[PDB]
Amino acid sequence: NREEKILNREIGFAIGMPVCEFDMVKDPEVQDFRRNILNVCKEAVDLRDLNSPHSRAMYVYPPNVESSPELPKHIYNKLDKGQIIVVIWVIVDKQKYTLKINHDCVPEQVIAEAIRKKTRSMYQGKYILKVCGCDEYFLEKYPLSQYKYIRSCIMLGRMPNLMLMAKESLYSQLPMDCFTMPSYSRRTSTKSLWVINSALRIKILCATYVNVNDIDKIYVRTGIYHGGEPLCDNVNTQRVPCSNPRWNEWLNYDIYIPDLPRAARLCLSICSVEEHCPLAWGNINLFDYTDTLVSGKMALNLWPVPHGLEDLLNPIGVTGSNPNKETPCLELEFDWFSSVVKFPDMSVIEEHANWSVSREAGFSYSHAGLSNRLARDNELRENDKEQLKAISTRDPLSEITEQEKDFLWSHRHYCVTIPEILPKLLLSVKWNSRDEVAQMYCLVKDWPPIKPEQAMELLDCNYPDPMVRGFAVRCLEKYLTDDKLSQYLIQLVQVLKYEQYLDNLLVRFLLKKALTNQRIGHFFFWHLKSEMHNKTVSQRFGLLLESYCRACGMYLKHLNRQVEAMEKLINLTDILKQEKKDETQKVQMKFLVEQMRRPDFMDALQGFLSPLNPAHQLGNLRLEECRIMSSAKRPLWLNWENPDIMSELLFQNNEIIFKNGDDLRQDMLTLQIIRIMENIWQNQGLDLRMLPYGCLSIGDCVGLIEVVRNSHTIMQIQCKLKALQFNSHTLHQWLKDKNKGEIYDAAIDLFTRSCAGYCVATFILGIGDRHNSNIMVKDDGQLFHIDFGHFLDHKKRERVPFVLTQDFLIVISKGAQECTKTREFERFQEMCYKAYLAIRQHANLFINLFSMMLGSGMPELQSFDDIAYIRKTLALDKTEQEALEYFMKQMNDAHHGGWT
Numbered sequence: 001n002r003e004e005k006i007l008n009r010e011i012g013f014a015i016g017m018p019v020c021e022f023d024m025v026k027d028p029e030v031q032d033f034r035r036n037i038l039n040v041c042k043e044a045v046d047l048r049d050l051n052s053p054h055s056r057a058m059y060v061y062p063p064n065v066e067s068s069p070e071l072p073k074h075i076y077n078k079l080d081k082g083q084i085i086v087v088i089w090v091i092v093d094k095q096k097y098t099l100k101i102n103h104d105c106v107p108e109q110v111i112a113e114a115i116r117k118k119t120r121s122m123y124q125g126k127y128i129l130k131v132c133g134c135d136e137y138f139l140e141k142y143p144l145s146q147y148k149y150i151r152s153c154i155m156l157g158r159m160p161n162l163m164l165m166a167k168e169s170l171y172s173q174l175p176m177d178c179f180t181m182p183s184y185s186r187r188t189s190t191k192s193l194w195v196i197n198s199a200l201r202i203k204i205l206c207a208t209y210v211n212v213n214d215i216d217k218i219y220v221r222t223g224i225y226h227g228g229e230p231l232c233d234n235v236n237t238q239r240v241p242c243s244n245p246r247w248n249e250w251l252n253y254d255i256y257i258p259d260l261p262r263a264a265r266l267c268l269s270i271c272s273v274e275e276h277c278p279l280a281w282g283n284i285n286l287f288d289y290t291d292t293l294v295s296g297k298m299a300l301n302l303w304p305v306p307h308g309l310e311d312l313l314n315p316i317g318v319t320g321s322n323p324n325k326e327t328p329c330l331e332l333e334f335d336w337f338s339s340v341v342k343f344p345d346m347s348v349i350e351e352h353a354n355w356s357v358s359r360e361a362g363f364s365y366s367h368a369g370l371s372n373r374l375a376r377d378n379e380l381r382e383n384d385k386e387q388l389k390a391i392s393t394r395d396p397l398s399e400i401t402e403q404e405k406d407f408l409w410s411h412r413h414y415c416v417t418i419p420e421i422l423p424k425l426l427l428s429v430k431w432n433s434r435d436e437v438a439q440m441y442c443l444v445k446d447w448p449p450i451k452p453e454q455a456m457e458l459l460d461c462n463y464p465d466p467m468v469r470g471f472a473v474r475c476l477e478k479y480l481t482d483d484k485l486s487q488y489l490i491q492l493v494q495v496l497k498y499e500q501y502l503d504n505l506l507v508r509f510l511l512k513k514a515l516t517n518q519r520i521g522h523f524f525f526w527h528l529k530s531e532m533h534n535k536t537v538s539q540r541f542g543l544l545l546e547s548y549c550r551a552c553g554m555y556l557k558h559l560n561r562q563v564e565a566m567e568k569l570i571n572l573t574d575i576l577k578q579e580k581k582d583e584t585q586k587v588q589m590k591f592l593v594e595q596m597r598r599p600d601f602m603d604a605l606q607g608f609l610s611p612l613n614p615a616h617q618l619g620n621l622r623l624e625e626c627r628i629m630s631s632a633k634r635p636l637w638l639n640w641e642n643p644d645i646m647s648e649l650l651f652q653n654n655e656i657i658f659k660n661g662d663d664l665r666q667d668m669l670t671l672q673i674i675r676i677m678e679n680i681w682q683n684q685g686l687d688l689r690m691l692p693y694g695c696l697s698i699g700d701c702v703g704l705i706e707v708v709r710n711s712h713t714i715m716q717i718q719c720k721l722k723a724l725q726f727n728s729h730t731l732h733q734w735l736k737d738k739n740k741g742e743i744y745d746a747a748i749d750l751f752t753r754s755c756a757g758y759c760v761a762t763f764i765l766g767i768g769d770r771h772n773s774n775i776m777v778k779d780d781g782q783l784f785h786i787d788f789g790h791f792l793d794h795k796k797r798e799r800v801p802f803v804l805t806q807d808f809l810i811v812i813s814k815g816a817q818e819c820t821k822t823r824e825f826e827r828f829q830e831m832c833y834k835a836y837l838a839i840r841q842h843a844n845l846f847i848n849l850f851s852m853m854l855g856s857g858m859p860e861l862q863s864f865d866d867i868a869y870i871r872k873t874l875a876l877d878k879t880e881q882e883a884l885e886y887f888m889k890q891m892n893d894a895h896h897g898g899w900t
């Protein structure tokens with residue numbers, strides 16, 4: 001118990017709330033989650049001790065690898081006859097050995113060649129390869145070029161520097177995990193829903209804590225929903241004065257109880273009124289986590305309305321009671337049937353489905369004629385098959401008419417042969433019919449596997465059914481690589497919020513992965529931790545974090561170092577940002593330096609892992625290199641030395657901007673999308689180099705941004721001394737001065753290509769207007785953008801954010817005055833055309849990634865109408881050639897010529 005108490009304190013520190021707060025929660029779903037989730041913890045720990053110590057090292061230092069071993073053409077073409085030059089260092093004093101080897105050599109073979117080289121100058125299974133300058137290892141027998149560091153080196157024409165290291169020197173530094181099961185580990189009739197012959201009704205008793213002025217009459221609005229879809233008409237109570245909110249009114253709903261789907265929810269509000277306004281809203285699950293239909297009395301504390309939403313109900317909103325109990329509390333009563341009513345078992349559901357299928361297969365021509373949702377097997381023509389195929393290739397937010405829905409449902413057995421149509425078929429199901437839903441379940445049960453990218457759609461707010469979501473998860477388990485899981489983790493974390501219950505298949509999958517791959521676990525922790533201030537999710541996220549922190553092993557202690565460092569920076573910046581706001585930069589800096597040198601602060605702010613990338617060790621702070629930036633919120637530009645033995649080879653100092661006051665969630669999302677765009681272009685042989693620098697939200701409007709070394713804003717360059725006297729050639733002159741001689745062409749090429757990428761990316765995403773201060777350029781010509789605080793339809797009709805002025809065209813056309821009518825500009829135009837269509841071809845991915853972020857509280861991504869902006873910029877309703885022409889016209893109009 002002494003050890004457990006010490007652990008609980010550590011967990012409490014990591015999560016920002018004491019573990020005893022979870023102990024006090026009475027709700028049995030909460031206590032069941034805490035206990036039942038521990039088998040995932042056990043399973044993970046068993047995987048980590050399977051082939052110890054290798055398996056422990058693989059957890060801590062997983063291979064940082066691309067999904068596909070196979071290289072593109074333009075990557076392979078960088079290799080000298082499929083061979084790579086690599087430098088292998090040995091500590092003995094630092095001895096480099098330069099090897100020329102085949103790109104697809106395994107680490108063991110590379111090590112052998114390094115020893116063979118060292119031999120000539122005058123075994124293999126005792127060593128491992130480490131990347132020089134950071135804590136990344138090549139512990140697994142992949143092709144060398146599949147490691148991302150290696151593939152990145154080949155792309156950029158940089159020399160790979162790897163360090164030879166004894167296995168036992170690594171293994172020795174990996175403490176043993178001793179996972180201990182916590183204390184909490186040790187802990188009428190029953191009738192089917194389908195037997196209850198009755199309509200649905202619910203009683204609204206009264207509201208308490210209804211405090212108001214403006215407001216005159218009020219009523220309780222209600223509705224039965226499956227996701228965002230109504231299952232019957234809404235039902236209002238009688239009108240009442242706000243000074244006495246009592247209704248005592250049974251509402252009757254147009255739905256039979258046996259037809260209630262598993263994820264059916266009651267969505268209600270309190271409204272004032274003719275102009276109607278909702279004062280407070282709340283949703284609840286009609287079945288609980290044990291499959292029991294709610295019965296008896298219930299008190300629901302309601303939530304405040306968010307501005308932007310003016311609709312009367314909020315079915316997309318969170319489900320469950322407000323934790324703040326000093327809020328409008330509506331009391332409700334459900335119907336009682338002398339018995340516990342439970343949702344039926346799968347065997348009962350399957351039997352019903354088989355009964356229906358058998359029944360339908362016997363239907364005559366004339367019977368089938370009675371409903372467009374019925375078809376006969378023989379009738380299915382090739383023309384119907386083509387129409388189905390055509391419906392399947394439409395994007396996720398393309399409308400499916402009622403006629404198409406009937407059509408899809410009637411040909412649901414054929415839809416099995418085109419399994420990517422599943423999302424469209426599922427939205428065609430009558431979710432208020434048990435006859436249809438039972439058959440949908442049996443189709444889902446045996447549905448062929450779909451790609452993870454397609455499966456992820458089925459985890460958004462449009463697909464609440466647990467069988468559909470379970471199918472989605474099975475697809476990720478079979479087909480989602482750790483690489484792609486890392487890439488889509490932000491979205492996968494967000495869709496946890498749409499789960500009806502704490503314990504579910506998705507959260508079990510994510511937790512297992514977080515606890516078997518520490519690179520995943522790190523960001524899993526930080527994405528959860530960053531929203532613990534949000535009361536609509538803090539319980540779910542807090543309990544999930546608890547379960548992670550109990551089983552993640554030694555990394556908990558490293559996370560607590562990061563948490564303490566961030567907490568010290570939050571505290572310092574809060575003080576600057578309140579007590580010294582008015583003071584000069586000089587005095588603020590004097591205060592900051594004095595506070596950071598206090599030995600407790602100094603120890604907390606040095607010697608820990610970068611939250612932006614835990615492969616990067618942050619050593620001693622260089623206070624002389626730190627500064628408070630001019631910007632409004634007083635961001636800290638911070639500089640630590642990299643204490644790696646071979647830091648000189650990667651970077652000697654790690655520079656991070658810490659910012660306390662701005663919401664960084666949209667930048668973080670935009671940077672993720674840019675990286676995904678870049679990856680699509682690279683995999684297609686289209687080499688447009690982007691710069692998706694690190695950005696991590698760590699809390700409520702607090703986060704970290706990776707500094708891009710040796711870069712400058714456009715303004716600085718064209719400022720020089722010089723505005724009325726600005727000259728279009730100044731930027732070209734700068735780059736040229738920086739790239740004299742044989743390299744000039746490489747710099748112009750890099751500028752051109754990077755420019756094309758950002759032109760296309762920013763137009764597609766509707767990013768905030770570009771100007772000379774939020775466009776930056778590196779010495780080598782790489783152009784990139786910063787500050788992605790705005791996106792999509794943020795103006796309110798499609799803007800062009802990145803207007804190529806004469807400055808940029810002059811660089812592209814190598815100094816020529818008439819730069820719009822040149823060869824270089826034509827090749828640049830061609831790059832933009834290819835990039836644009838390449839993204840159009842992957843439009844469903846981008847739509848789905850945005851759809852998964854809808855239930856986040858990001859101000860410019862509130863509904864599917866915001867996402868519709870992308871449908872416009874990618875011209876998805878148009879033809880591919882019509883889309884090209886549309887893109888050309890937007891560029892043409894914005895540039896006043898050039899694009900035709």
Ligand SMILES: CCn1c(-c2cnc(C)nc2)nc2c(-c3ccc4c(c3)[C@](C)(Cc3ccccc3)C(=O)N4)ncnc21
Nearest residue numbers: 627628629630637657693705706707708709711786787788
């Ligand atoms: C890639 C991320 N990144 C950002 C950035 C910030 N905020 C958001 C939301 N996004 C991106 N700024 C970045 C800067 C940068 C910004 C402003 C600026 C300078 C550098 C200098 C040149 C140097 C300086 C002086 C005093 C204090 C600090 C720096 C200067 O005088 N003003 N350099 C690299 N990378 C950046």
